[model samples]
Structures are given as C-alpha cells and as structure tokens.
Target: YNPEDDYTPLTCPHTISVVWYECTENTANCGTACCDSCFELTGNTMCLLQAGAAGSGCDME
Candidate 1:
C-alpha cells in the first residue's frame, strides 16, 4: 500500500487537500506525528487523521 504509488478513495463524500506525512518510527523518518495524531500504515508508515478531513471545497451532495 505505497501511497506514493497506491491510491485509496476517501470514505467521506468530498475532496480534500489530503496533506499527509510519513510518521514511521524506525524507518525513513517522516517526522513528528501530524497534528499530534499519526496513523499507522503497513509498516513504519503513518499519518494524521485530520489529513483525511476535507478542509474546504467539498462537493455537496
């Protein structure tokens, strides 16, 4: 599930900037957890939950 190559659809019915960063502990070192909340990906991979939220420009249903 390489974000760099793999693409996943958002559960939310809207589009977002989706600013995510690699939050791996002993890996390539993405940096501090995003917004103090980092998600764990496959291995040594993670990102913030907010990174999944649609800040603005979300298409209305």
Candidate 2:
C-alpha cells in the first residue's frame, strides 16, 4: 500500500543510506568484492557493477 503524503522531509521518521565503490579489475574476487553483475562502462577500463552485501553475493569477503 502507499502512504499518504502528509509528512515533510524534516518530519519524516525514516532514514536511508547510499554507498558506492569502485574497482580496477573485472571482479572483486581479485581480493575485494565482486560485481553482482557486470557490463562494459567504458571498454573494460571502467564498468558498472552492483556490489551488494559482501560475502552474500560474488564478493570474497
């Protein structure tokens, strides 16, 4: 269900966090976390990957 929009941002009782990271390799399996999935963002040198909860996805730790 959707909630009513009778609240303001300062009055809202919720919090959210956004975290982002980067890697130089194809996968974080190289010693860090891995991409949940991968695609070339700029021809291998750069790409976009989803690094969700570590140790739960393709991450090594």
Best by lDDT: 1
Each model's lDDT: 0.30, 0.26
Estimate, for each residue in 24-53, the C-alpha lDDT of model 1 and write its tens digit.
222243333332332335321323322323
Query: Best by TM-score, which number?
Result: 1
lDDT of 1 at 26: 23
Residue 53 of candidate 1: its Cα lDDT?
A: 37
lDDT of 2 by residue, 10-32 (tens): 43222211112332232434213
Q: Which ten residues in a row have the lowest lDDT in candidate 2?
A: 1-10
Error of 1 at 31 (Å): 2.2
Pairing residues by index, what is the TM-score of model 1?
0.21
TM-scores of the models, in the given order?
Answer: 0.21, 0.16
